[PDB]
């Protein structure tokens, strides 16, 4: 939570006030090492698990280089900006660039590399002694942070390669250059008693590097002696939109298992705020996921042909792809395992829940919750062989990763960066859950993660039962009171016993009932302007998933879409002013209509041009080029009818209109749009459902 907005600050400058520190042109080099853990790891810890994912990311530090197209901007200052903004987008804490000199190119480094992108990732917060999970995490920060450096270095390496320039990533596990030296030269750190010290990162950090012949404007080293200006009043208050100087210390007062956002102040309820009738919920084949439908031909030729490609049109997304795909085989086991003895005392489920949450926040989740994995949350059958899926684990641990407010401010929602937002949050989530599930397995509890590339559960109902969101108008997206609908979830299921969270009520039903903004702004009118309906046993505002799927897969003026998330009033900057509007919305019902109307009069959702840090590049046949058909640049739309609720006819595809369990990708089942439209018109009202259920319980 900042005090001042960053709405006028370009993304390449990052969340810290690096531009206010004292700098000089050059410094004298000297021996230096990276920060290490204070304490050593206890015997059984997370160490083995973060090391496995670090080895995996090591494989993608190099790779093939695409041919050079003609759309890469020449100016090294503009390349520098974009690459620093890319690194902040992946959650580097600090970024700089320096020139590579002959002492660096003389080792195993490719001799055509002239430049280095240098980035730091801050150590995560550790639990205190005696807190749940302390022994899992204590002493693993170098390795946990290295794994994240490797991930970032691989993704960015891969981006530059796909732009057509050779590039290689480096980190402590695998480096051909002196990392520490470069961090000094690029102006991230200074040396104290042979150890790097970085302004603002008081917990310690580790480094990643990308070397490349892609020429870039270089930064200047920090002044080597004395105070740099990190406590000047402008910096302490963060007037330009940066982190206040006391934010770290205020956050450290909260125990790590509570997260950064105060989810403890939200009202909990036993039953969710919308009707869920478990006995009437049928399980759905994986083959009914509408992307799988698209893949198999159910939605027509165009959609079939675009399905592999639609989210991989931008080079940055293609940098992520190999990590995403190769995490899949590590997702874990469905079989029961024997407890192992490792992991300290596991007999208290309340403490286990705290430990798992802490672990999630240590690895970088924004929200962690836990619910029972009910059988109706698992798909009925897989889509490749058509075999039944068993409800094999008892618990679902559900994490939210924020898609990134600032990037989205700059975007249309359906332009060239949309899919990269999705993919970054899927990638990061899969990494976190992979590690966490792996840790459960090392303790002898079966655990398996469920990513965008391979999932056997439907995230939504778990997000709901874990109390991380309420049902919203957008439809197939649940909304959180602090980051709104701006998230991707990741889930791992496991048998580790844990107390469960409970659903939340923060007044969203009433708020969404007076708002239509997401619906108004959807490019294909997929989002309902009317009332909630019953759908496969539960109450929901059902969007038209056919129309949405066709637009996201097929539209040629960007890479997919998430405009609905962008335009929602609950999607807000992490500032005091933002948080206060969220609190008003929750605590003061009379204010909601006013907030809804003012969100428009203030032009929230307008594209903010300062935040547009990315290049409009479309990869066609292995080469990046300017967008063939152009680029979506949408603005706010005017109001629709008072009568649009009554006139819009959407289709819905509950189980009866889906491919049945057992169907694979080899079969085709053309979508029955007629039937889906008539099914929507026949859907039961929630009110009638409530009364029908009451009439049985007499
Ligand atoms: C396929 C898919 C889509 C497709 C097709 C949807 C469909 N229904 O087939 C389309 C393209 C429409 C789509 C769009 C988007 N999606 Co999508 N999608 C998925 C995916 C991969 C599978 C859904 C599914 O398996 N099939 C659909 C069958 C099962 O659906 P159904 O019978 O219609 O049921 C749906 C809902 O009713 C709900 N649901 C099921 N049972 C229950 C029970 C209860 C009680 C409740 C309340 C809800 C609920 O889950 C289904 C979601 O599609 C999930 C990931 C996952 N494994 O769940 C992400 C997922 C739902 N998508 C998500 C998002 C964010 C998007 C987009 C915003 C795109 C983006 N840029 O990120 C848009 C939002 C569109 C909208 N209006 O909501 C997020 C939602 C997270 C959240 N905060 O709740 C998910 C969970 C991915 C993730 N891991 O974060 N998506
Ligand atoms: S519902 Fe689909 S198409 Fe509509 S705005 Fe959301 S993501 Fe885009
Ligand atoms: S835009 Fe309005 S209606 Fe749509 S989800 Fe957000 S609050 Fe609800
Ligand atoms: Cl999606
Ligand atoms: Na908004």
UniProtKB/TrEMBL annotation:
Q: Which residues bind [4Fe-4S] cluster 1?
A: 512, 515, 518, 568
Indicate which residues the UniProt annotation says bind [4Fe-4S] cluster 2. 522, 548, 561, 564
* Binding locations of cob(II)alamin 1: 290, 379, 403, 422, 457, 459, 474, 476-478, 487-489, 538, 542, 561
Q: Name one Pfam family in it.
A: Fer4_7
In which residues is cob(II)alamin 2 bound? 290, 379, 403, 422, 457, 459, 474, 476-478, 487-489, 538, 542, 561
Chain ranges of the 4Fe-4S ferredoxin-type domain: 502-532
* Cited InterPro entries: 4Fe4S_Fe-S-bd, 4Fe4S_Fe_S_CS
Gene3D superfamilies (UniProt xref): 3.30.70.20
Q: Identify the keywords attached in UniProt to this record, alphabetized.
A: 4Fe-4S, Iron, Iron-sulfur, Metal-binding
GO-annotated molecular function: 4 iron, 4 sulfur cluster binding; metal ion binding
Tree of life domain: Bacteria
PANTHER family for the chain = IRON-SULFUR CLUSTER-BINDING PROTEIN (PTHR42827:SF1), IRON-SULFUR CLUSTER-BINDING PROTEIN-RELATED (PTHR42827)
Q: What is this protein called?
A: Oxidoreductase, NAD-binding/iron-sulfur cluster-binding protein
């Amino acid at each position: 939570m900042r005090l001042y907005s960053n709405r006028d600050r370009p993304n390449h400058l990052g969340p810290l006030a690096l531009e206010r520190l004292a700098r000089v042109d050059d410094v004298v080099a000297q021996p230096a090492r990276q920060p290490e853990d204070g304490f050593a790891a206890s015997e059984d810890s997370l160490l083995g698990d973060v090391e496995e994912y670090a080895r995996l990311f090591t494989r993608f530090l190099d790779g093939p280089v695409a041919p050079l197209g003609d759309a890469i901007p020449d100016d090294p200052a503009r390349r520098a900006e974009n690459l620093k903004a890319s690194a902040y987008f992946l959650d580097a804490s600090m970024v700089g660039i320096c020139r590579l000199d002959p002492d660096d190119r003389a080792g195993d480094c490719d001799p055509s590399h002239t430049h280095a992108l240098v980035f730091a990732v801050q150590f995560g917060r550790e639990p205190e002694a005696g807190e749940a999970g302390a022994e899992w995490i204590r002493g693993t920060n170098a390795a946990r942070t290295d794994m994240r450096c490797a991930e970032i270095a691989a993704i960015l390496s891969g981006y530059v390669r796909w732009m057509g320039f050779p590039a290689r990533g480096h980190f402590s596990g695998d480096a051909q250059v002196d990392l520490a030296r470069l961090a000094v030269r690029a102006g991230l750190a200074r040396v104290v008693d042979g150890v790097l010290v970085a302004p603002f990162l008081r917990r310690g950090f580790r480094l990643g590097v990308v070397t490349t012949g892609y020429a870039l404007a270089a930064d200047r080293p920090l002044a080597p002696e004395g105070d740099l200006g990190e406590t000047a009043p402008e910096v302490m208050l963060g007037i330009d939109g940066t982190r206040p100087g006391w934010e770290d210390a205020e956050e450290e007062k909260r125990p790590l298992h509570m997260g950064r956002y105060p989810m403890e102040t939200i009202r909990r309820v036993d039953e969710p705020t919308t009707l869920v009738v478990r006995q009437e919920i049928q399980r759905v084949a994986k083959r009914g996921d509408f992307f799988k439908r698209a893949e198999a031909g159910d939605l027509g030729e165009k959609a079939k042909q675009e399905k592999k490609r639609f989210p991989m049109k931008h080079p940055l997304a293609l940098g992520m792809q190999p990590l995403i795909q190769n995490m899949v085989p590590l997702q874990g086991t469905r079989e029961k395992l024997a407890p192992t003895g490792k992991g300290g005392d596991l007999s208290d489920p309340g403490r286990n829940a705290e430990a798992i949450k802490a672990l999630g926040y240590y690895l970088g989740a924004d929200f962690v919750g836990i619910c029972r994995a009910e059988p109706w949350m698992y798909y009925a059958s897989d889509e490749v062989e058509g075999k039944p899926i068993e409800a094999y684990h008892d618990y679902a641990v559900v994490m939210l990763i924020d898609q990134g407010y600032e990037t989205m401010e700059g975007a249309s929602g359906d332009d060239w960066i949309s899919a990269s937002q999705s993919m970054r949050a899927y990638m990061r989530g899969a990494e976190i859950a992979g590690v966490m599930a792996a840790h459960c397995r090392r303790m002898g509890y079966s655990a398996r993660s469920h990513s965008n590339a391979h999932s056997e559960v439907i995230h939504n109902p778990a997000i709901l039962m874990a109390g991380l969101g309420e049902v919203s108008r957008i439809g197939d997206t649940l909304l959180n009171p602090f980051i709104g609908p701006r998230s991707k979830s990741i889930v791992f299921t496991t048998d580790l016993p844990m107390s469960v969270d409970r659903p939340i009520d923060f007044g969203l039903q009433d708020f969404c009932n007076q708002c239509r903004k997401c619906a108004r702004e959807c490019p294909c009118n997929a989002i309902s302007f009317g009332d909630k309906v019953m759908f496969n046993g539960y109450e929901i505002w059902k969007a038209d998933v056919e129309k949405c799927t066709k637009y996201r897969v097929t539209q040629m003026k960007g890479s997919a879409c998430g405009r609905c998330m962008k335009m929602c009033p609950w999607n807000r900057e992490d500032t005091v002013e933002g948080r206060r509007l969220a609190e008003l919305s929750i605590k003061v019902p009379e204010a909601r209509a006013a907030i809804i109307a003012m969100d428009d009069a203030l032009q929230n959702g307008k594209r903010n041009l300062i935040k547009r840090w990315w290049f409009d590049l479309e990869v066609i046949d292995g080469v990046a080029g300017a967008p063939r058909m152009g680029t979506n640049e949408r603005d706010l739309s005017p109001d629709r009818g008072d009568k649009i609720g009554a006139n819009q006819k959407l289709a819905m595809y509950p189980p009866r209109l889906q491919p049945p369990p057992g169907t694979t990708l080899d079969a085709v089942l053309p979508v029955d749009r007629s039937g889906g439209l008539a099914e929507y018109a026949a859907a039961e009202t929630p009110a009638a459902a409530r009364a029908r259920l009451k009439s049985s319980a007499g």
